[PDB]
């Protein structure tokens, strides 16, 4: 099991500078090239640089030559990209991508991505509103005020067993702040005929995770 | 530069049916053409290296073949959870390393209404200022949909943002949520909120409304 494993989501002032990392897994780390690849939101891919993880050569994208800077610990089976004099065009998913130079040159494994945000804000975590309705009925969960757009909902009973989760929505950017929904159906009659009066919401995100009692009508 | 044409941008298509989705390349690139699968908020997967060469785990309906400027990825039998965005990638003059535009894939089905749900404000959220009036649209297809915000029957432009959930990976259906933002002031001085909602599988326009006082 070939496994890239990336460092978490970073927010960044215009000027400053950001440094991923990238730790490989399940096979000779020395014996293949690394890339980096960057995606703004809703763009295309675009490949930034790779490194040698043997000799630690590299090569990088002339679009980022001059403020980018691939390194590499072989002890610690790691490469790291760092990017100077951020912009808010910097603002993007960075991966790292495994080479593999047999036949013809191809990226057979990717890291799960960083998010990289740069922003004029600062972070913050969420803030949780319930949304109550006033056959299936709709329960749902508000997130605001967050920042970076790194978030994850989950939905408990009052038992404390799993709600299942349904389809996230993606969050809408506003004054610099990022926001969310989230929803789950239970059926209308088990809600009427039911001693529960509320359920829990749970996010998860990189400044603080939080939870809301969500009524049930 | 090699620059990557991919056609088409767009395409639907139904669950059993065969896919074909094209790249062209500006100069001759021999075999040196890959193909990649990206699901939303997720990284790239490689589906196919040397332009006809499948990748260890991915299933066998994937295919490529071509060589010089021409290349084609083909599903031979589409599944629902292949709705993605498919890039090509040419990896024989580098840098750069061209990716394509991307083919954006979506599962074509029957027609299906949404069920539409509207949520108020929350009193701690009103004691904030701000009000956030919510409208979720669920398991609709077509994507295509028309979310009407109305404040005492006056129609809403400019104060709402939306989103759509990625496409089921089982029923291939769509969801949507909106949301209305108000400042409390001008919440409280109106009565009656409604969300208006227009799409193919309902035969007339479908409004949940609320009255600030329940
Ligand atoms: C946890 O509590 C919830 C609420 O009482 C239970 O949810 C019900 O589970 C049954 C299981 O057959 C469903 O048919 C109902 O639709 C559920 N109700 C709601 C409102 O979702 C759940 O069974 C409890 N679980 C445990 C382990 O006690």
């Known amino acids: 099991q070939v496994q890239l494993v990336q460092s978490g989501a970073e927010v960044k002032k215009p000027g400053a500078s950001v440094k991923v990392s990238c730790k490989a897994s399940?096979?000779?780390?020395?014996?293949?090239?690394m890339h980096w690849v960057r995606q703004a939101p809703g763009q295309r891919l675009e490949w930034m640089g790779w490194?040698?993880?043997?000799?630690?050569?590299?090569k990088y994208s002339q679009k980022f030559q001059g403020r980018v800077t691939i390194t590499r610990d072989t002890s610690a089976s790691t490469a790291y990209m760092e990017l100077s004099s951020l912009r808010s065009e910097d603002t993007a998913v960075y991966y790292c991508?495994?080479?593999?130079?047999?036949?013809?040159?191809?990226?057979?494994?990717w890291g799960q991505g960083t998010l990289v945000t740069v922003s004029s804000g600062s972070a913050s975590a969420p803030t949780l509103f319930p949304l109550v309705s006033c056959s299936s009925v709709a329960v749902g969960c508000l997130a605001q005020d967050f920042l970076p757009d790194s978030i994850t909902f989950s939905w408990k009973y009052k038992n404390n067993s799993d709600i299942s989760s349904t389809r996230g929505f993606p969050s809408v950017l506003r004054g610099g702040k990022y926001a969310a929904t989230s929803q789950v159906l239970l059926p209308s009659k088990d809600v009427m005929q039911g001693t529960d009066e509320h359920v829990v919401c749970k996010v998860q995100h990189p400044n603080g995770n939080k939870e809301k009692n969500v009524p049930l009508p | 530069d090699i620059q990557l044409t991919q056609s088409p941008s767009s395409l639907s298509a139904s669950v059993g049916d065969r896919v074909t989705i094209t790249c062209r390349a500006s100069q001759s690139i021999s075999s040196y053409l890959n193909w990649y699968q990206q699901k939303p908020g997720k990284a790239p997967k490689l589906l196919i290296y040397a332009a006809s060469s499948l990748q260890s785990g991915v299933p066998s309906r994937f295919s490529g073949s071509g060589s010089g400027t021409d290349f084609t990825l083909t599903i031979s039998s589409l599944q629902p959870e292949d709705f993605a965005t498919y890039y090509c990638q040419q990896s024989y003059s580098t840098p750069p390393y061209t990716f394509g535009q991307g083919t954006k894939l979506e599962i074509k089905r029957t027609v299906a209404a949404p069920s539409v749900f509207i949520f108020p404000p929350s009193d701690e959220q009103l004691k904030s200022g701000t009000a956030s009036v919510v409208c979720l649209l669920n398991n609709f297809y077509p994507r295509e949909a028309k979310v009407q915000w109305k404040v005492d029957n006056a129609l809403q432009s400019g104060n709402s943002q939306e989103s759509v959930t990625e496409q089921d990976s089982k029923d291939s259906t769509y969801s949507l949520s909106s949301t209305l933002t108000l400042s409390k002031a001008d919440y409280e001085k109106h009565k009656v909120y409604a969300c208006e909602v227009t799409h193919q599988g309902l035969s007339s326009p479908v409004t949940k409304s609320f009255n600030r006082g329940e």
């Open positions: 399940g096979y000779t780390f020395t014996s293949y090239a």
């Open positions: 991508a495994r080479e593999q130079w047999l036949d013809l040159a191809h990226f057979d494994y």
């Open positions: 490194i040698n993880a043997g000799n630690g050569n590299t």
